[PDB]
Amino acid sequence: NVPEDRIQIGQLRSAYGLNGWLWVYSNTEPMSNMFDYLPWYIETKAGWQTVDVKRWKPHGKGLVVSLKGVSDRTGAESLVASNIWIAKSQLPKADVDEYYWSDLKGLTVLGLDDEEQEVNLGQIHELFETGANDVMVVRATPDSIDSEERMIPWHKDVVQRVDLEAGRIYVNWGVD
Numbered sequence: 001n002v003p004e005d006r007i008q009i010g011q012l013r014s015a016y017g018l019n020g021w022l023w024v025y026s027n028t029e030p031m032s033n034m035f036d037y038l039p040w041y042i043e044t045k046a047g048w049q050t051v052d053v054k055r056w057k058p059h060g061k062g063l064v065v066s067l068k069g070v071s072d073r074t075g076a077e078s079l080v081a082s083n084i085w086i087a088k089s090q091l092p093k094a095d096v097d098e099y100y101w102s103d104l105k106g107l108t109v110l111g112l113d114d115e116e117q118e119v120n121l122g123q124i125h126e127l128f129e130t131g132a133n134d135v136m137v138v139r140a141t142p143d144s145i146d147s148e149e150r151m152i153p154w155h156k157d158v159v160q161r162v163d164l165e166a167g168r169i170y171v172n173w174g175v176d
């Protein structure tokens, strides 16, 4: 539960869209570093709640975030303006740094179109090193949106969440 010693790393602002997203203010720099902490302890009007980030993206001025379990407008409005904390001894853990191909075999890659709708890009087929960076190879499947093979950079700003439980990888990557 709520850690005794904690640091405020941000604040959920206004509701964004109709799919439960929310604008969020970060106390970290670069701002998106707030997304490397898992989980989040937010103080809502109905007590404390622990929350996991599923995906996020910069939008014009600032940032908008998608929290696991918050999928509608009403779910976002009831969190609006709540503060975000982390334990004093909580180290950031970006999933890109914590996972390797062997752990990812057979996961579905979920991208995001311009209209913030989740698209089944396909399945992770390979994850190699080029020398300068790591690249994730995604191949189409019968479930997939199309038949293309996509090269997606294995960088924390693109591949944001690995969820072995759901067998999915959430990436801020579009169709075209």
Ligand SMILES: [K+]
Pocket (backbone or CB within 6 Å): 140, 141, 142, 143, 144, 145, 146, 147
């Ligand atoms: K397909």
